Scaffold this active site. Structure first.
Site, PDB file in Angstrom:
ATOM      1  N   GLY A  45       0.833  -1.187   0.000  1.00 55.54           N
ATOM      2  CA  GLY A  45       0.000   0.000   0.000  1.00 55.54           C
ATOM      3  C   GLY A  45       0.870   1.241   0.000  1.00 55.54           C
ATOM      4  O   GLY A  45       2.083   1.137   0.266  1.00 55.54           O
ATOM      5  N   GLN A  50       3.821  10.147   1.854  1.00 58.39           N
ATOM      6  CA  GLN A  50       5.158   9.532   1.916  1.00 58.39           C
ATOM      7  C   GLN A  50       6.019   9.958   0.756  1.00 58.39           C
ATOM      8  O   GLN A  50       7.239   9.848   0.801  1.00 58.39           O
ATOM      9  CB  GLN A  50       5.034   8.022   1.860  1.00 58.39           C
ATOM     10  CG  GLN A  50       4.092   7.434   2.868  1.00 58.39           C
ATOM     11  CD  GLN A  50       4.092   5.934   2.802  1.00 58.39           C
ATOM     12  OE1 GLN A  50       3.095   5.324   2.431  1.00 58.39           O
ATOM     13  NE2 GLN A  50       5.222   5.321   3.151  1.00 58.39           N
ATOM     14  N   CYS A  90       6.892  -0.279   7.561  1.00 58.27           N
ATOM     15  CA  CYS A  90       6.511   0.901   6.801  1.00 58.27           C
ATOM     16  C   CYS A  90       7.687   1.332   5.933  1.00 58.27           C
ATOM     17  O   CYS A  90       8.836   1.282   6.379  1.00 58.27           O
ATOM     18  CB  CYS A  90       6.090   2.028   7.762  1.00 58.27           C
ATOM     19  SG  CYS A  90       5.850   3.697   7.013  1.00 58.27           S
ATOM     20  N   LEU A  91       7.410   1.717   4.687  1.00 63.80           N
ATOM     21  CA  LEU A  91       8.472   2.171   3.782  1.00 63.80           C
ATOM     22  C   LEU A  91       9.171   3.422   4.357  1.00 63.80           C
ATOM     23  O   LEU A  91      10.373   3.615   4.179  1.00 63.80           O
ATOM     24  CB  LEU A  91       7.912   2.424   2.371  1.00 63.80           C
ATOM     25  CG  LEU A  91       7.296   1.242   1.595  1.00 63.80           C
ATOM     26  CD1 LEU A  91       6.572   1.707   0.336  1.00 63.80           C
ATOM     27  CD2 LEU A  91       8.377   0.236   1.208  1.00 63.80           C
ATOM     28  N   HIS A 132      -3.712   1.925   8.099  1.00 65.95           N
ATOM     29  CA  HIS A 132      -2.333   2.373   8.130  1.00 65.95           C
ATOM     30  C   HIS A 132      -2.073   3.472   7.078  1.00 65.95           C
ATOM     31  O   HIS A 132      -1.299   4.407   7.316  1.00 65.95           O
ATOM     32  CB  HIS A 132      -1.452   1.118   7.982  1.00 65.95           C
ATOM     33  CG  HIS A 132      -0.044   1.385   7.563  1.00 65.95           C
ATOM     34  ND1 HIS A 132       1.041   1.095   8.361  1.00 65.95           N
ATOM     35  CD2 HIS A 132       0.458   1.864   6.399  1.00 65.95           C
ATOM     36  CE1 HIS A 132       2.152   1.384   7.709  1.00 65.95           C
ATOM     37  NE2 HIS A 132       1.822   1.851   6.514  1.00 65.95           N
ATOM     38  N   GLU A 133      -2.706   3.358   5.913  1.00 71.56           N
ATOM     39  CA  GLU A 133      -2.543   4.378   4.872  1.00 71.56           C
ATOM     40  C   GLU A 133      -3.271   5.685   5.285  1.00 71.56           C
ATOM     41  O   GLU A 133      -2.670   6.759   5.249  1.00 71.56           O
ATOM     42  CB  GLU A 133      -3.077   3.894   3.523  1.00 71.56           C
ATOM     43  CG  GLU A 133      -2.514   2.568   3.011  1.00 71.56           C
ATOM     44  CD  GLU A 133      -1.004   2.531   2.953  1.00 71.56           C
ATOM     45  OE1 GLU A 133      -0.327   3.540   3.266  1.00 71.56           O
ATOM     46  OE2 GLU A 133      -0.493   1.463   2.581  1.00 71.56           O
ATOM     47  N   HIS A 136      -1.527   7.840   7.454  1.00 75.01           N
ATOM     48  CA  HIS A 136      -0.513   8.605   6.772  1.00 75.01           C
ATOM     49  C   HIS A 136      -0.979   9.982   6.339  1.00 75.01           C
ATOM     50  O   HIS A 136      -0.270  10.970   6.548  1.00 75.01           O
ATOM     51  CB  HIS A 136       0.020   7.817   5.579  1.00 75.01           C
ATOM     52  CG  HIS A 136       1.296   7.101   5.868  1.00 75.01           C
ATOM     53  ND1 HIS A 136       2.424   7.758   6.310  1.00 75.01           N
ATOM     54  CD2 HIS A 136       1.626   5.786   5.826  1.00 75.01           C
ATOM     55  CE1 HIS A 136       3.388   6.889   6.533  1.00 75.01           C
ATOM     56  NE2 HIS A 136       2.927   5.684   6.247  1.00 75.01           N
TER      57      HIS A 136
HETATM   58  C1  LIG Z   1      -0.017  -4.243   6.418  1.00 78.64           C
HETATM   59  C2  LIG Z   1       0.710  -3.026   6.927  1.00 78.64           C
HETATM   60  C3  LIG Z   1       0.952  -1.854   5.974  1.00 78.64           C
HETATM   61  C4  LIG Z   1       1.178  -2.338   4.573  1.00 78.64           C
HETATM   62  C5  LIG Z   1       1.750  -1.221   3.663  1.00 78.64           C
HETATM   63  C6  LIG Z   1       3.283  -1.096   3.700  1.00 78.64           C
HETATM   64  C7  LIG Z   1       3.842  -0.015   2.759  1.00 78.64           C
HETATM   65  C8  LIG Z   1       3.577   1.351   3.382  1.00 78.64           C
HETATM   66  O1  LIG Z   1       4.469   1.994   3.969  1.00 78.64           O
HETATM   67  N1  LIG Z   1       2.381   1.898   3.315  1.00 78.64           N
HETATM   68  O2  LIG Z   1       2.196   3.129   4.003  1.00 78.64           O
HETATM   69  C9  LIG Z   1       3.865  -2.471   3.379  1.00 78.64           C
HETATM   70  O3  LIG Z   1       3.935  -2.884   2.225  1.00 78.64           O
HETATM   71  N2  LIG Z   1       4.216  -3.191   4.432  1.00 78.64           N
HETATM   72  C10 LIG Z   1       4.751  -4.541   4.325  1.00 78.64           C
HETATM   73  C11 LIG Z   1       4.057  -5.298   5.464  1.00 78.64           C
HETATM   74  O4  LIG Z   1       4.075  -4.843   6.609  1.00 78.64           O
HETATM   75  N3  LIG Z   1       3.436  -6.455   5.159  1.00 78.64           N
HETATM   76  C12 LIG Z   1       3.501  -7.126   3.855  1.00 78.64           C
HETATM   77  C13 LIG Z   1       2.269  -7.955   3.872  1.00 78.64           C
HETATM   78  C14 LIG Z   1       2.203  -8.458   5.262  1.00 78.64           C
HETATM   79  C15 LIG Z   1       2.714  -7.292   6.128  1.00 78.64           C
HETATM   80  C16 LIG Z   1       3.794  -7.666   7.165  1.00 78.64           C
HETATM   81  O5  LIG Z   1       3.343  -8.383   8.311  1.00 78.64           O
HETATM   82  C17 LIG Z   1       6.287  -4.560   4.525  1.00 78.64           C
HETATM   83  C18 LIG Z   1       6.808  -5.947   4.326  1.00 78.64           C
HETATM   84  C19 LIG Z   1       6.976  -3.622   3.546  1.00 78.64           C
HETATM   85 ZN   LIG Z   2       3.639   3.231   5.860  1.00 75.77          ZN
END
Ligand SMILES: CCCCC[C@H](CC(=O)NO)C(=O)N[C@H](C(=O)N1CCC[C@H]1CO)C(C)C
Ligand SMILES: [Zn+2]
Length: 164
Positions: A45, A50, A90-91, A132-133, A136
Protein backbone atom coordinates in the site's frame (compact mmCIF):
# COMPACT_ATOMS: atom_id res chain seq x y z
CA UNK A 1 8.07 7.58 -12.44
CA UNK A 2 9.45 6.24 -9.18
CA UNK A 3 9.02 8.81 -6.44
CA UNK A 4 11.20 9.29 -3.33
CA UNK A 5 9.73 7.90 -0.12
CA UNK A 6 10.35 10.12 2.92
CA UNK A 7 11.77 8.51 6.05
CA UNK A 8 11.79 9.47 9.72
CA UNK A 9 12.54 11.98 11.11
CA UNK A 10 11.50 13.94 7.96
CA UNK A 11 9.02 16.52 9.29
CA UNK A 12 7.11 16.38 5.99
CA UNK A 13 5.74 12.96 7.00
CA UNK A 14 3.91 14.82 9.75
CA UNK A 15 1.97 17.02 7.29
CA UNK A 16 -1.84 16.70 7.13
CA UNK A 17 -3.19 16.29 3.60
CA UNK A 18 -5.98 18.37 2.04
CA UNK A 19 -8.85 16.82 0.05
CA UNK A 20 -8.48 16.30 -3.71
CA UNK A 21 -10.70 18.89 -5.41
CA UNK A 22 -11.74 16.91 -8.46
CA UNK A 23 -10.23 13.73 -9.91
CA UNK A 24 -8.52 14.93 -13.07
CA UNK A 25 -5.66 13.83 -15.35
CA UNK A 26 -3.06 15.24 -12.94
CA UNK A 27 -4.57 13.33 -9.98
CA UNK A 28 -4.62 10.19 -12.12
CA UNK A 29 -0.92 10.72 -12.94
CA UNK A 30 -0.11 10.95 -9.22
CA UNK A 31 -1.98 7.66 -8.76
CA UNK A 32 0.32 5.92 -11.28
CA UNK A 33 3.63 7.21 -9.91
CA UNK A 34 2.39 6.13 -6.47
CA UNK A 35 1.54 2.59 -7.65
CA UNK A 36 4.87 2.41 -9.53
CA UNK A 37 6.75 3.45 -6.39
CA UNK A 38 4.67 1.00 -4.30
CA UNK A 39 5.49 -1.95 -6.54
CA UNK A 40 9.14 -0.87 -6.80
CA UNK A 41 9.58 -0.79 -3.02
CA UNK A 42 7.73 -4.06 -2.55
CA UNK A 43 4.98 -2.36 -0.56
CA UNK A 44 1.38 -3.53 -0.46
CA UNK A 45 0.00 0.00 0.00
CA UNK A 46 0.98 3.69 -0.32
CA UNK A 47 -0.30 7.14 0.76
CA UNK A 48 0.62 10.36 -1.15
CA UNK A 49 2.15 11.93 1.96
CA UNK A 50 5.16 9.53 1.92
CA UNK A 51 6.03 10.83 -1.52
CA UNK A 52 5.75 14.51 -0.46
CA UNK A 53 2.34 14.95 -2.14
CA UNK A 54 -0.09 16.34 0.39
CA UNK A 55 -3.51 15.27 -0.91
CA UNK A 56 -5.84 12.47 0.25
CA UNK A 57 -4.80 9.77 -2.16
CA UNK A 58 -4.08 6.14 -1.23
CA UNK A 59 -3.23 3.18 -3.49
CA UNK A 60 -3.41 -0.44 -2.25
CA UNK A 61 -2.64 -3.73 -4.02
CA UNK A 62 -2.61 -7.00 -2.12
CA UNK A 63 -2.72 -9.46 -5.05
CA UNK A 64 0.26 -11.81 -5.54
CA UNK A 65 0.03 -11.15 -9.24
CA UNK A 66 -0.08 -7.32 -8.83
CA UNK A 67 -3.41 -7.00 -10.70
CA UNK A 68 -6.06 -6.01 -8.17
CA UNK A 69 -5.63 -2.26 -7.75
CA UNK A 70 -7.58 -0.32 -5.11
CA UNK A 71 -7.65 3.49 -5.19
CA UNK A 72 -8.91 5.49 -2.20
CA UNK A 73 -9.33 9.21 -2.85
CA UNK A 74 -10.91 11.25 -0.07
CA UNK A 75 -11.60 8.17 2.10
CA UNK A 76 -13.88 8.46 5.11
CA UNK A 77 -14.30 5.89 7.87
CA UNK A 78 -17.98 5.11 8.36
CA UNK A 79 -17.65 2.44 11.08
CA UNK A 80 -15.14 0.11 12.78
CA UNK A 81 -15.18 -2.87 15.17
CA UNK A 82 -12.91 -5.18 17.19
CA UNK A 83 -9.12 -5.28 17.79
CA UNK A 84 -6.36 -7.13 15.99
CA UNK A 85 -2.74 -6.68 15.04
CA UNK A 86 0.02 -8.04 12.84
CA UNK A 87 3.68 -7.06 12.59
CA UNK A 88 3.69 -4.06 10.26
CA UNK A 89 6.57 -2.50 8.48
CA UNK A 90 6.51 0.90 6.80
CA UNK A 91 8.47 2.17 3.78
CA UNK A 92 9.00 5.44 5.72
CA UNK A 93 10.54 3.51 8.66
CA UNK A 94 12.97 1.71 6.20
CA UNK A 95 13.36 -1.83 7.56
CA UNK A 96 11.59 -2.13 10.91
CA UNK A 97 8.52 -4.12 11.96
CA UNK A 98 6.24 -4.09 14.96
CA UNK A 99 2.83 -5.30 16.16
CA UNK A 100 0.34 -2.41 16.15
CA UNK A 101 -3.18 -2.50 17.59
CA UNK A 102 -5.82 -1.91 14.89
CA UNK A 103 -9.57 -2.19 14.52
CA UNK A 104 -10.44 -5.63 13.13
CA UNK A 105 -13.21 -4.50 10.74
CA UNK A 106 -13.78 -1.18 8.92
CA UNK A 107 -16.41 0.30 6.57
CA UNK A 108 -15.28 3.23 4.44
CA UNK A 109 -16.57 5.44 1.65
CA UNK A 110 -14.25 6.84 -1.03
CA UNK A 111 -13.88 8.07 -4.63
CA UNK A 112 -12.23 5.70 -7.12
CA UNK A 113 -9.70 6.51 -9.85
CA UNK A 114 -12.49 7.96 -11.99
CA UNK A 115 -13.80 10.09 -9.14
CA UNK A 116 -16.76 7.75 -8.67
CA UNK A 117 -17.77 7.25 -5.00
CA UNK A 118 -17.91 3.71 -3.56
CA UNK A 119 -18.31 2.06 -0.15
CA UNK A 120 -16.11 -0.81 1.10
CA UNK A 121 -16.22 -3.26 4.04
CA UNK A 122 -12.78 -4.58 4.91
CA UNK A 123 -11.57 -7.31 7.28
CA UNK A 124 -8.19 -8.96 7.84
CA UNK A 125 -5.15 -7.48 6.12
CA UNK A 126 -7.15 -5.03 3.93
CA UNK A 127 -8.72 -3.49 7.09
CA UNK A 128 -5.29 -3.04 8.72
CA UNK A 129 -3.74 -1.69 5.52
CA UNK A 130 -6.52 0.90 4.96
CA UNK A 131 -6.06 2.08 8.57
CA UNK A 132 -2.33 2.37 8.13
CA UNK A 133 -2.54 4.38 4.87
CA UNK A 134 -5.33 6.71 6.18
CA UNK A 135 -3.09 7.36 9.21
CA UNK A 136 -0.51 8.60 6.77
CA UNK A 137 -2.76 11.30 5.29
CA UNK A 138 -3.05 12.79 8.77
CA UNK A 139 0.70 12.76 9.50
CA UNK A 140 0.54 9.64 11.71
CA UNK A 141 2.93 6.67 11.63
CA UNK A 142 2.55 3.16 13.21
CA UNK A 143 5.40 3.74 15.68
CA UNK A 144 3.35 6.56 17.32
CA UNK A 145 1.29 3.74 18.80
CA UNK A 146 4.35 2.30 20.56
CA UNK A 147 5.90 3.08 23.98
CA UNK A 148 8.61 5.79 24.35
CA UNK A 149 11.29 3.12 24.76
CA UNK A 150 10.22 1.18 21.67
CA UNK A 151 9.85 4.35 19.67
CA UNK A 152 13.34 5.14 20.88
CA UNK A 153 14.74 1.75 19.77
CA UNK A 154 13.02 2.08 16.35
CA UNK A 155 14.49 5.56 15.87
CA UNK A 156 18.01 4.39 16.84
CA UNK A 157 17.86 1.27 14.63
CA UNK A 158 16.66 3.22 11.62
CA UNK A 159 19.47 5.73 12.26
CA UNK A 160 22.11 3.03 11.61
CA UNK A 161 20.92 2.50 8.05
CA UNK A 162 19.68 4.92 5.25
CA UNK A 163 23.35 4.96 4.19
CA UNK A 164 24.88 1.54 3.47
C1 LIG B 1 -0.02 -4.24 6.42
C2 LIG B 1 0.71 -3.03 6.93
C3 LIG B 1 0.95 -1.85 5.97
C4 LIG B 1 1.18 -2.34 4.57
C5 LIG B 1 1.75 -1.22 3.66
C6 LIG B 1 3.28 -1.10 3.70
C7 LIG B 1 3.84 -0.02 2.76
C8 LIG B 1 3.58 1.35 3.38
O1 LIG B 1 4.47 1.99 3.97
N1 LIG B 1 2.38 1.90 3.31
O2 LIG B 1 2.20 3.13 4.00
C9 LIG B 1 3.87 -2.47 3.38
O3 LIG B 1 3.94 -2.88 2.23
N2 LIG B 1 4.22 -3.19 4.43
C10 LIG B 1 4.75 -4.54 4.32
C11 LIG B 1 4.06 -5.30 5.46
O4 LIG B 1 4.08 -4.84 6.61
N3 LIG B 1 3.44 -6.45 5.16
C12 LIG B 1 3.50 -7.13 3.85
C13 LIG B 1 2.27 -7.96 3.87
C14 LIG B 1 2.20 -8.46 5.26
C15 LIG B 1 2.71 -7.29 6.13
C16 LIG B 1 3.79 -7.67 7.17
O5 LIG B 1 3.34 -8.38 8.31
C17 LIG B 1 6.29 -4.56 4.52
C18 LIG B 1 6.81 -5.95 4.33
C19 LIG B 1 6.98 -3.62 3.55
ZN1 LIG C 1 3.64 3.23 5.86
Amino acid sequence: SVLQVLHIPDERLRKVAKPVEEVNAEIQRIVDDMFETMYAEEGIGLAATQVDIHQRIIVIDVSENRDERLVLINPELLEKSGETGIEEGCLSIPEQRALVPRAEKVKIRALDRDGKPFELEADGLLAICIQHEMDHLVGKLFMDYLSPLKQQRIRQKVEKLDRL
